[PDB]
Design an enzyme around this catalytic site. Sequence first.
Site, short mmCIF file in Angstrom:
data_model
loop_
_atom_site.label_atom_id
_atom_site.label_comp_id
_atom_site.label_asym_id
_atom_site.label_seq_id
_atom_site.Cartn_x
_atom_site.Cartn_y
_atom_site.Cartn_z
N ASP A 282 8.67 -7.08 9.64
CA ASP A 282 8.10 -6.61 8.38
C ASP A 282 7.53 -5.22 8.55
OD1 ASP A 282 6.95 -6.31 5.91
OD2 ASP A 282 5.49 -7.95 6.13
N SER B 295 0.56 -9.45 1.12
CA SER B 295 1.06 -8.09 0.75
C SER B 295 -0.12 -7.22 0.32
CB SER B 295 2.22 -8.19 -0.29
OG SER B 295 2.82 -6.93 -0.61
N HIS C 84 9.20 -9.07 4.84
CA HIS C 84 7.95 -9.19 4.12
C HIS C 84 7.83 -10.53 3.35
CE1 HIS C 84 4.28 -7.58 2.66
NE2 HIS C 84 4.68 -7.43 1.41
#
Lengths: 286, 284
Positions: free
Chosen positions: A210, A153, A263
Amino acid sequence: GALIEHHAASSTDQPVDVPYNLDMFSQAAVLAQETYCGEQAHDYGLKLGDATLLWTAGDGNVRQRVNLYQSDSLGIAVAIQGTNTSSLRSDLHDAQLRPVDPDSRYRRFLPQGTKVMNGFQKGYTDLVDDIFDHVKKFKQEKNESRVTVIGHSLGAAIGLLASLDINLRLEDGLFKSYLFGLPRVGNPIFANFVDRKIGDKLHWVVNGRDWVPTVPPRALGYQHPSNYVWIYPANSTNWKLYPGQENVHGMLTVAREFNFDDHEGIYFHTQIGASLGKCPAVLGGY
Amino acid sequence: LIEHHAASSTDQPVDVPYNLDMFSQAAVLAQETYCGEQAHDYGLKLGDATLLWTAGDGNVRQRVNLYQSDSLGIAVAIQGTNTSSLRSDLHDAQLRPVDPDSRYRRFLPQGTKVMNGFQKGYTDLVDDIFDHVKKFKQEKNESRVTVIGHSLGAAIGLLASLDINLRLEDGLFKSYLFGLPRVGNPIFANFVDRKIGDKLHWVVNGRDWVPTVPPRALGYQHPSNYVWIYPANSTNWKLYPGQENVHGMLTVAREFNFDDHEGIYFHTQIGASLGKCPAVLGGY
Ligand SMILES: *[C@@H]1O[C@H](CO)[C@@H](O[C@@H]2O[C@H](CO)[C@@H](O)[C@H](O)[C@H]2NC(C)=O)[C@H](O)[C@H]1NC(C)=O
Ligand SMILES: *[C@@H]1O[C@H](CO)[C@@H](O[C@@H]2O[C@H](CO)[C@@H](O)[C@H](O)[C@H]2NC(C)=O)[C@H](O)[C@H]1NC(C)=O
Ligand SMILES: *[C@@H]1O[C@H](CO)[C@@H](O)[C@H](O)[C@H]1NC(C)=O
Ligand SMILES: *[C@@H]1O[C@H](CO)[C@@H](O)[C@H](O)[C@H]1NC(C)=O
């Protein structure tokens, strides 16, 4: 303001089988997850797979948490904390998105015209001096020349910068990088440089649809480095490697049909995600 | 960031099913819009089309030429521009997504947005176009209306085509658009498909930059079903179904050029610095 009229590559190469050691990718995955474990942050000695926790700084508030391990397979492993899609949706506006010059600590090693996203570089420059200090310290204490950078991330974005920087500024350079749910970080000059300098060390993966690796957008001049693994469908065992940059057979083929859920999920049998993995993080099992 | 989704079709390209004689006939009229000395040569004939009326001069408003055409009816062709001009003027307030103009807003879905610069281009001309389309449909006993444009004229053209179809008696017969920029958001694009999709014909030449702008990242979306001439200026053309087809233009994502905007479309030349005046039908 103005339209970016610079070209950028979009590879037409056929997807290939993933050639990497997935035990090592999985080992990176559990460390990426452990960055979200606040209560275990200073549990020095904790072992996750082959990696023993030595040092931690940051807390996810002022600075991202960073965890540093000795790992049999990865050497001195530096894992940086990510965030969640709702934080990224709130924070990625205005000054954050500005493509800026490389920080002066490493500007002279990178091509002129290199730009990186302001908020990601800021996340890195807030940690870089403590990371360098402690990498050097534990390399010396463990008699270990290998350094691996890991992140999910926002952590992956900070990780890409750390991976390139470590490779250019620290003796012995980088051994491996393992990045999960990687946002775009820099411009085509940056991306080409990443490929040139750490392409043979870099491993990165995108889970399904994502949203995060679609931002910031190419229309703002941002460009991914080469060769991502794409897990599709999300959380499945169906993975392939998409060669070159911004491969047209990959993500691009769904990039306006993203979601905010992929994600976090299952990456090579290991859970990663602030709301999803457990504490302490578990290696494999999914 | 625009967090809204949009379709990107995965359907395979198919053969072009269109009457290409009519597409070429449109192409010569799209070119004649660039001919300033002939602008008021009323009676001039290009293919099957006779010039009846012209307004605008390319400076304060785009030139529009209005014809009686055997195959297209009352044909309205709107002047475009060149890539150099678009590169200079597409900034700041011009790119802004805005509400439809009050003349046609109630006919369009809530949430529709169109690019401000292109809508101004249209609203500077729309009343004169409407008056004169009505005048000449009645004088020529003609219910068919066709809208034509290249470049900026294609963008103005798309709005005209939809607007005419919704607001004017008999609506739209055909629309022929060349080197079409993005004009509105997904709500707009969907509505275009719904209301004029079976009348709309539009084509992109090769790696033309113009149909890549404004960007999807600003919220803009093309309507369905473009013809792609690839390579540029060749006779290799296919239709790319649905919106923003992933097998088409997007496959040369960010590897555009500023030269394919002008060129050979279905054997006829189009472009501000490339045609003849008067424009020639076919030959290439
Ligand atoms: C992959 O795994 C993630 C994590 O389990 C899934 O995320 C959940 O998705 C649903 C709706 O799709 C949400 O309501 C949940 O809140 C999500 N959980 C988390 C922790 O984000 C995701 O949907 C999976 N993707 C696929 C394609 O199966
Ligand atoms: C298609 O046709 C146009 C015809 O003009 C070509 O455009 C010219 O390309 C050259 C080389 O790039 C430029 O130097 C000229 O200025 C262009 N002319 C104009 C009027 O723009 C275009 O290159 C052709 N493309 C292909 C792929 O054949
Ligand atoms: C996402 O992270 C933010 C910032 O740490 C936190 O406040 C929030 O609780 C998280 N949201 C969800 C849905 O878990
Ligand atoms: C493009 O068109 C404009 C008309 O406004 C003209 O002034 C300019 O010289 C043209 N450029 C080229 C390269 O033909």
